[PDB]
Amino acid sequence: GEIAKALREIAKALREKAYALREIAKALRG
Amino acid sequence: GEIAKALREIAKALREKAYALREIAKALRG
Amino acid sequence: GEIAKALREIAKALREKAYALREIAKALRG
Amino acid sequence: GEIAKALREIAKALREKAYALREIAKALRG
Amino acid sequence: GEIAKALREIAKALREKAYALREIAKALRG
Amino acid sequence: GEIAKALREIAKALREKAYALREIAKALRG
Amino acid sequence: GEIAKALREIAKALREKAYALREIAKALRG
């Protein structure tokens, strides 16, 4: 369904944010 | 549907937050 | 609908957060 | 509706987070 | 309703995040 | 309900983020 | 259901963000 697909798109965007947050942690360690 | 469209708008905003978080990571590397 | 309108209001708030995160990146570059 | 009202409450909390993120940017500029 | 109550629980968690973000700003100022 | 339960799981994950943000605040104060 | 499943996927992504935020705190302590 379109609603479930859009919710999965939200989850995908949140995973992109998680990736970026890990990059922030790595930048701080470096 | 309007609800699914709005959920996709939320996903797009979250992708722009991911953009900004990558920008923070780059600023910390520099 | 009121639900779709409220979801769009959430999207707008998330864009507001993205803008604020970009301000953080700008402060870190400076 | 109660669901729309709760969604608007979520949007309000997200705007509160945006304010705090701008406060972080201001602290970094200082 | 249980759905509205769960959405209000989400907003409550977001306000705790806002609190923490304000304390991050306070820490950076000091 | 399964939808309400999943929303409560989202709230719980947001509380975990709030926990982490408090840890960031305490790290900056230390 | 597909909607509840997608909401649980959102919660999973939020937990990934929480993990990353904890790693930011650890990097700041380090």
Numbering used by the authors:
A (entry chain D), B (entry chain C), C (entry chain A), D (entry chain F), E (entry chain G), F (entry chain B), ...: 2 to 31
From the article:
αHBs are oligomers of 5 or more α-helical peptides that assemble into coiled-coil structures with central solvent-accessible channels. We targeted two properties of αHBs: oligomeric state, which directly affects the internal diameter of the channel; and the identities of channel-facing residues, which fine tune this dimension and introduce different chemistries. The αHBs are loaded with an environment sensitive dye (in this case, 1,6-diphenyl-1,3,5-hexatriene, DPH) that binds within the channels and fluoresces. Accordingly, challenging the array with analytes leads to differential displacement of the dye across the array to give a fluorescent fingerprint.
Despite the requirements for aliphatic residues at a and d, up to 40% of these can be changed to other side chains without compromising barrel integrity. We introduced mutations at one or two of these sites to generate four groups of αHB: Group I had entirely hydrophobic interiors, but with different sizes and shapes of channel; Groups II and III had polar uncharged or polar charged residues, respectively, at specific points along the channel; and Group IV had aromatic residues installed in their channels. The twelve Group III peptides had positively and negatively charged side chains, Lys and Glu, incorporated either singly or paired at a and d sites; and a single peptide with Asp at d. Finally, one third of the designs were crystallized and yielded 12 X-ray crystal structures, all of which were open αHBs with fully accessible channels. Focusing on the small molecules, the αSA signal from the more-polar AAs and CHOs is dominated by the polar and charged Group II and III αHBs.
